[PDB]
Write a protein that binds this ligand. Structure first.
Ligand SMILES: [Mn+3]
Ligand SMILES: [Mn+3]
Ligand SMILES: [Mn+3]
Ligand SMILES: [Mn+3]
Ligand code: NA
Ligand code: NA
Ligand code: NA
Ligand code: NA
Ligand code: NA
Ligand code: NA
Lengths: 197, 197, 197, 196
């Protein structure tokens, strides 16, 4: 079944940009809950279907979307987060940089639009840098709740805008979080994602 | 494996209220598409799960909801329709009639409010008479697209408000469709559901 | 122009159930932001309407829904909260208590159903005890984000399930918050609302 | 007062690709209903605000989005439609041709993508070729119901996937409609919107 991926660093390795207690709760509590809920959903869909109860199997689709989205979203999230002193922060280079410039004008303009995109989210949700699977063309998208980036879009970089991703440190000052997190984004990971398939 | 149920009468039995062409298409084409989509979603989900691809599994949630919802909703829809010369039309009686009367004042008022609810649906959707699983109180709810009536509420009588349910015969004049369909509602089916919920 | 209502008590007066900092931010930051956004939207709608720019006028709808809902919800929310030493806590009496018994069997069943409702919200949202304006029947509903309770239902008592409502004090342990808040619900306010709806 | 815009041709001018009956219904009944609906929402929002009733004003937001969106979407829709014999059909030229070829690979690749997006719409909705207001970066997007394309994205070409846009002629065969409509898309208009 699905498992919680370990982090590549200690919970407090993203300070002062994200607090240890946030990293701790977020990974060990919130994501774990999505892992658990993802396994429970697949198991119920399975057991309902072996019984020919499609009404029941189809009634689990929202929980599969919520938890399956959560597990995926957070997995990609830790992956593109890293300590500022090491591979976190800065900006991309090579092929990824060139497409960002060609699709957004500059990295700085992309940053602004993404922060703007994050700001505009009403309630719980995510903003993503994504590409078209076929052309590679880049876009800034947002997702409500745990809805994922899938299908025609491949996700490259995600910032979680749920209140639980920042409130303990930044409280209602969500702008400060959105500005701060760029220091711990791992653009090496984003490039790998972009430069593949 | 999920299957398209046959109707209990011929495609033209509900004329003049719903045309034979509408019924034919609605069943043979539209509902069939939902059945196939449901089995396809469920196969693709199991295929993924065996290969530990939870990303793919979760990505199929929308199609499971949509097609799983279409199958259930249309299944119940056909069941609460019957030719006017038989079990269709008229008004409910017995415990059902008293329950309608309790929660809506009269059958006529319920019929008025449901017609309004159908009229107020923006885009594609369904209106249902539903029953609270604990108290038994009745209400009119609306659902977008093919989202089902599930959880706290049990569906008893549905009317489809997607344009394919009426456009060939009534065009934009949805109010005429909503008024006409009461002539072919199977209140014997509804009362059966009412007894078991 | 819309204005921030004043609380009827000091920020720390709902302790230990809700912390002072939470009440402070929730009222002076979050609600104040909705009030500002609502006025901003209504000014913008008027400015475009006078220029015959109906494209602009329509585009301001999500903001009008978002802020105007947030204004309504929180206004109501402060009104059905009070200190335990005073009007807060306990159980309702009179017509309300009995109406609750009629539609949920007991006050405690309703309580469990409310907490179950709150817990089941995916993402940001609210749970309400509402009353049907025609039948007088009570029900528990949920709303996404700041989507209000309007139309056929009249809100009677609301609980806020957005994370900023509890996270500083309860962190991810929302069930502690949902359980804890009943000690500061103002049933007399809810009773006034019941009487007049 | 918002008003129903005039079409620049007779209702039967888009046949055999869109029928006279669909066109007449779509314009004279559906869009007219969005026009009246918008004006009513703006009125009641005007009434409400004067009364200091902000609960009533906010409660009108769903209708404003729905009707205001429908007015905008259909306005643009007729503008990017024209009789095949004239401004309709064919391919876009100019820098718009170049952009599509840059962003999608080919017009043929782009077309298929949109047709697939349109087919992929669950329920009522639209598909749009849009550009980013700041970069000119093209995207295919979809909107539920009458939700419009505003803000960071500028719509350039819309195709309506509501069932009332095709069912009378094509019935359930939505793909037939999606493939057909390309012979009456006005790319001159789409090219204007692109050049802003
Ligand atoms: Mn999160
Ligand atoms: Mn149908
Ligand atoms: Mn709040
Ligand atoms: Mn249309
Ligand atoms: Na990490
Ligand atoms: Na591009
Ligand atoms: Na907020
Ligand atoms: Na709205
Ligand atoms: Na959409
Ligand atoms: Na036909």
């Amino acid at each position: 079944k699905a498992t919680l991926p370990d982090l590549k660093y200690d919970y407090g390795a993203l300070e002062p940009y994200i607090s240890a207690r946030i990293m701790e709760l977020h990974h060990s509590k919130h994501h774990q809950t999505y892992v658990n809920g993802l396994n429970s959903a697949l198991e119920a869909t399975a057991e309902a279907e072996a019984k020919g109860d499609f009404t029941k199997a189809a009634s689990l689709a929202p929980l599969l979307n919520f938890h399956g989205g959560g597990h995926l979203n957070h997995t990609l999230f830790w992956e593109n987060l890293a300590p500022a002193s090491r591979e976190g922060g800065g900006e991309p280079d090579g092929a990824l940089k060139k497409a960002i410039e060609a699709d957004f004008g500059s990295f700085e303009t992309f940053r602004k639009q993404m922060n703007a995109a994050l700001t505009g989210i009403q309630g719980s949700g995510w903003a993503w840098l994504a590409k078209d699977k076929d052309s590679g063309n880049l876009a800034i998208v947002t997702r409500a709740n745990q809805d994922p980036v899938t299908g025609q879009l491949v996700p490259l970089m995600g910032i979680d805008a749920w209140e639980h991703a920042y409130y303990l440190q930044y409280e209602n000052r969500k702008a400060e979080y959105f500005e701060a997190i760029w220091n711990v984004i791992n653009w090496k990971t984003v490039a790998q994602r972009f430069e593949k398939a």
